[PDB]
Amino acid sequence: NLPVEPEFEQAYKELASTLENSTLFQKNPEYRKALAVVSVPERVIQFRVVWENDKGEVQVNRGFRVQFNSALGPYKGGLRFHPSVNLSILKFLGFEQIFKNALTGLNMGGGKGGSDFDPKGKSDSEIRRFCVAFMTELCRHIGADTDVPAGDIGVTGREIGYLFGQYRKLRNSWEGVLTGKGGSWGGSLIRPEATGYGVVYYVEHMIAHATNGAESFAGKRVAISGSGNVAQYAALKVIELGGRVVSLSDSQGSLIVKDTAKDSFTPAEIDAIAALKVDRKQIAELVTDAAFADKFTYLPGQRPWVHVGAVDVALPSATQNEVSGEEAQALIAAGCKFIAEGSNMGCTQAAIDAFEAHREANKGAAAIWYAPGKAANAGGVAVSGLEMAQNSARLSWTAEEVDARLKDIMKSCFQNGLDTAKEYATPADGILPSLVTGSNIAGFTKVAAAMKDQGDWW
């Protein structure tokens, strides 16, 4: 009699299969029972949001707040304002967030909110009104110790501001209940960077471990795919470390640098890309300009790096599922051996399959290492937890302090994943341990242990 939830069912099935395939279950059979408890959210709330549009007409929407798990800390998850949001999607997102937060190693729980609201083609007044209604119906289920919503698709700084103001009006307490506040009224630094620096740090750690030091980032075709803020800050970080960016194209076409093996993107070039990519303008408008025509070869329509023959590092941030077979076997031939999905679900299954096959059949530089989006990005969540810590301490840190804490967070996450992969998913000497299996098992084991310790199952 359970309702069908396609995305959540697929995620649960994948997790179960991954756990069963490994040697976790034979050593700890009781952990089977743990699975049956983590699947059920601790609490799901659906409410009705009634607001008024610009023409004085009543509009009714549904808001959700899934609080999936709180064994390791307070619930923390973004709010998604998209027309497609339902209980299945939010359940799936919360379930993934549990293990992501577990991998980050801070004290945050798993959860996810949002609504069916469509912010596109809405005036600022309409967004303000909806936010006020939503927070009125939601404020009784959140708190600095209970729920920390953040931003996501559809919830920018504007919505965060509106929600925070209404919460302040209702609860009459200026506290750090939401994440993503402006810098003036209790925000955080390095927040826009977040995942962009984090993925780069994670890749650097993996390279240092795999090659036992030597080259970390210098003189490598890092190829920061995508044209979002994530890609921009990843490119900036790899440039600072000494790497070259050769493929910085968005989902639309292929705005590849002039020389895929020699030329590197400049900070000015990245800033220009951001300036003409923030709005509806795309890389077509960029190549129309002479500055990005001769300097950047245009190969629209068939993904950024498919035509690129010289790539060394992979950051699938351009499109979802942008790494199919052809490019998967091209990467090892082209010299691209180390991968990390900067975004979520940014590569196909074939990339992971090729990664596993080549890493099992080879070792060292030959073994292509790929990092999973559960533990790769890890930047938004970490900086959100640091912002929560800043709020709790009533003191605002500096950029470098936050950067250092992000460094240590990603080091801890990488270490956790690697050790868990090594101990359970035995590689039998050589054979770079599976980051996917390690990262999926580490979070589950940590959550299950915490829940057993707290009497959530026995």
Add this chain to the structure above:
Amino acid sequence: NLPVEPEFEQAYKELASTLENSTLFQKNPEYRKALAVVSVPERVIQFRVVWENDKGEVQVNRGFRVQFNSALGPYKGGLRFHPSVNLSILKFLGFEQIFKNALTGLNMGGGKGGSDFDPKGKSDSEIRRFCVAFMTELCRHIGADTDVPAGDIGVTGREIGYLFGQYRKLRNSWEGVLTGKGGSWGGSLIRPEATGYGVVYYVEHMIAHATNGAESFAGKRVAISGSGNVAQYAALKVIELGGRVVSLSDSQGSLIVKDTAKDSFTPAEIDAIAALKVDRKQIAELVTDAAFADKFTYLPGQRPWVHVGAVDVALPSATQNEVSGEEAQALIAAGCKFIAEGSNMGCTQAAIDAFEAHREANKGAAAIWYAPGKAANAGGVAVSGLEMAQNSARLSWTAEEVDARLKDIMKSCFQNGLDTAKEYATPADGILPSLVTGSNIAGFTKVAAAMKDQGDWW
């Protein structure tokens, strides 16, 4: 993107069709908007209940609480513990309960709770454990002014006691938050009898109005099918008033008196019926007596509606379906002009269609007046509200006071339905107003008006 909810969708479609097929939308077009706002529940809470069975093994179940509407008063749902409950079923039940409570006249909202827990084949320890866990996860959402759950399928006096105890232990407040409490610790009188007495009073009002007092509920071939306690109280009340019970069936054979034209039941027979049906004994055990067998023509594996023969006023206290289309036309042939429908879904949809067609084709005196289950069975909810009134007043009333208030409530229900049918359903001269349409329009109009007054839709 909205999930499929069969029962709820069917109920909403029926309500919309009934609203459109009347002269209410023409007079108040804005009420269209109201419909949309009432469709979305005010709040839905799903939680996880983790308990321990008799063998010390962890069991995880899902608990629900739907607070649909509270325009007219606090939510006053029931709790259903059955291994079929999901969000769709509870939404459907809550949606019906809104308009039922609106028809009653006391200030109660619409709501419904429960869980997938299966009380069947469970020890008392297991029921205690589950109740304690459920109330631990639920206490933060209910309250004497917020939510007042009651009993339903699966929830009896045992479960009510356990839940009340745990609520008292948590909230440290002895208040009226559940209805169905024992008589010693803040219960109510006439609580069992409620449904049967209420439906009897309602049909007595119907007959008195229709025949202008010429015909009363006494001295009639009152069927009273079904062998539930509801039928017991109905039979007792009709016997006291001077009526005659002729056909008390169950989901098995029918205990029909041989002289159904004249002879009828006795209070002792009703007590024997109650004793048998409490202990799962079929009423064939009652016909086992030689005198009983001679004085009661049993129809094994059959309800009277199949072979009804001769009854004057059918009162189906039974459950889903039962009375069929062929059975409906047999009833109209037999002269069942004043049917009761003591319990909801006592007759099929085709039965209702046949009743309406024959009522409109006839000329009032021979019109088959069908009482809708929303308005017919209001004794339970009314007595629940009276128990809440007793709790609030800190003073337990006597049986006669509760009986008088029940009479007032059923009279108010009948009056509301008749007046709303006269205004909108617009019955012609020498015809009986549609009680189903009247009772639907009454509830909807009352709820919509209250919501417009309280600024829920403009």
Add this chain to the structure above:
Amino acid sequence: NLPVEPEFEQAYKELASTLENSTLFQKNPEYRKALAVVSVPERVIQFRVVWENDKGEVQVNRGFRVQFNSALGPYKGGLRFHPSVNLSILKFLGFEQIFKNALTGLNMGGGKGGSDFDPKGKSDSEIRRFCVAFMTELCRHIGADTDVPAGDIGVTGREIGYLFGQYRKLRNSWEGVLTGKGGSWGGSLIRPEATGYGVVYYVEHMIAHATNGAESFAGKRVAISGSGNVAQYAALKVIELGGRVVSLSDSQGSLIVKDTAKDSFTPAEIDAIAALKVDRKQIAELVTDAAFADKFTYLPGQRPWVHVGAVDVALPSATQNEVSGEEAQALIAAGCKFIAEGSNMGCTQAAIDAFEAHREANKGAAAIWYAPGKAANAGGVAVSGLEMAQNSARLSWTAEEVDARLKDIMKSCFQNGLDTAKEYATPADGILPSLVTGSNIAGFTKVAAAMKDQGDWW
């Protein structure tokens, strides 16, 4: 390791012995377990009260609040301000109050508060200061639905007023949380009368059962013990009902009429004695007054029970231990057949032993029926619950309304005692079914049943 609590241990031992001796444990063995759970209070709070005396010196006292049982309702109890209160005494009083309230029939639980504060020889400022401190430390635990303190020894109307004011100042809610409030600001009527009226109704029901519709108060030598408000209003009521008052005794000798056989007290005499009690003149000064000494025979340094002459109704209203074993023998020799203590919580055990021996001696109709203090003085607690009901209903009743409810409560108490005595402690000969054992078993059975229903023990 359990601390010694003389009074509580004695009370528990008595209750256990009475339970075992009666034929209840044979039919319900599981009730033994109940005895283990009811013994432990649900919650004891001790706090420190620091106040300032008239000379500006810091004074430190200890306040207590014992909440024994809340199975049957909120924790209604009393506050005792006496320089003897400790945890043992309050525990004993609360334990008795549980079963007293259970016999009463309203929904109140068992509890008791107070402090070591000595109100004697303290200015009004000192009482105000201490009350304010006490309520400041106590308001966190009381509530209209949680705890209802009332007055007792040491806590008069003045203290109640001070405590109520401070509670209102702290909690910012004008609610009924204390009982004994003044008439202007939400008090109650018949409250000064209360127990003095109540016991009278009790004994009349006793008469209505003993003689089976025969000689009432009119022609009964009712023996008032002191001009305390209890016996004051008892004497007034019996004088109205035709009963003759044939004694009165404060802390000194006995105030008996000259012709105690025929002549009795009058309302004018009663209020004169009341006025002398207000000025602490007592009966001695009335004997110094010429007219009373001419109309009343004085017996200095002697209780009436020593020189009852001929009596048939007796009541030790003064305090405990008024009637001794020899005094009880004198009473029965005088023909006292309806001793019923509307006060005197416990009495000399010899008196109760003699009463029980004579009731089991099979004296027929002319047998001395002794009513226990627990059931006889239920009038005060009943009126306290009625004041709570008035507060909850936001309406002040009239005197005759409260009188009618008091009569119903006393009838319910008597009926409960008789039925429970007949059920378990069944008398072989119907003479005087042991009101003490009946009331004990009634209270215990009711509380244990409610606790089993609420899952407090299994």
Add this chain to the structure above:
Amino acid sequence: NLPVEPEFEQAYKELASTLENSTLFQKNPEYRKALAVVSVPERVIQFRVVWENDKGEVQVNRGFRVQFNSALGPYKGGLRFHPSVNLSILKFLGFEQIFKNALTGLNMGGGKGGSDFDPKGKSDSEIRRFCVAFMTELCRHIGADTDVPAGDIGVTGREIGYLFGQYRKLRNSWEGVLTGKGGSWGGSLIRPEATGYGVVYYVEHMIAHATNGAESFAGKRVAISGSGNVAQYAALKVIELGGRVVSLSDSQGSLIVKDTAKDSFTPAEIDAIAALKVDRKQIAELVTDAAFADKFTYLPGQRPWVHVGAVDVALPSATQNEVSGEEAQALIAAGCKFIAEGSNMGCTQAAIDAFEAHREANKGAAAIWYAPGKAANAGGVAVSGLEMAQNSARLSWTAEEVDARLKDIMKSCFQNGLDTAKEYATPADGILPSLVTGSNIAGFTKVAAAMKDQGDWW
């Protein structure tokens, strides 16, 4: 009328005598009043815990929570689950904890909880059930700002986990309300090493002050007695600092390495001892091993101090009153001067008298300094407060950070005690200040000043 409390009365009498003996009262006579107000706890709660064992069988236990003082900070104290726990013992422990926390220097107050529960011979299910019941009855009084329970005798990590889980389930806020949480879910570091490291730092500071840095722990003979986590980590710390471990004991015969003046216990030996104590076995049960027959000299029954040989410092952590007067003289003759009670409540009073007499008898070079247990036990409470600080700051520190804070805390505590001893006890030239008297006066003065500032007495 006040109940007898042997342990608490003895502690209060000792404190009063110590206060009177010094010259603090002569300078501040008003402080006498303070002594009364601190004696009365601010709040005591006793509740009833009803739980079911592995075979149903409802069991009733008594839970306590004493909040003595909160002048200096939130209440903070352990929970003791022992069959001997009553109100007197918990009162005594809380009273001591007040001044211990005052000497520590952080903002914590005095308190103590627990129950008569006997965890010995109980399954994990039984512990889980009791913890859940206890926290259900207790969560109404604790909070991140009100009460912070921790572990003690009977409450290990398991109980802490169970209590934390139930607290989260009741109040849906993941906060720091208990101390001793696991490392994954908001724990701390240096928690097991709290006591041993702290006592080592304290004794190092005292040695540096006494000898003006003439001798440090490098090349120093240390008698680490009392096998346990405290002793193990103290030995490890002194070994790191260069100290030589010479003796060791437990509940059985002393270990004593071969050379009580030259040989030192290796970390491997300490790990072996830890393994022995974990498995409930002893040194006498491992003499047959090679590691003990060649590197150890098992001493049956006789205390380690009787065969110290050459030593100058000691820590009697084995049993109460471990060092005798004759043994004290033997230690002084052997050169023992700088003893400190690591985790012991109190040695033989004759030993303390001998130490105090020798403090004035000769110079500190010959005066044997003894540190009080309350001053040297600050490690546990300090680390508990650091865990509270970590929870509040929403960040987990590193081991070295906690170590640095512990060093600062012990420096502060030692300085406070030394200055208070110097100014009040005013020892002459060449006399070592009384550490016990100094610590007592320091705690009392700090608490009394804070209470006077906050208006708790005047």
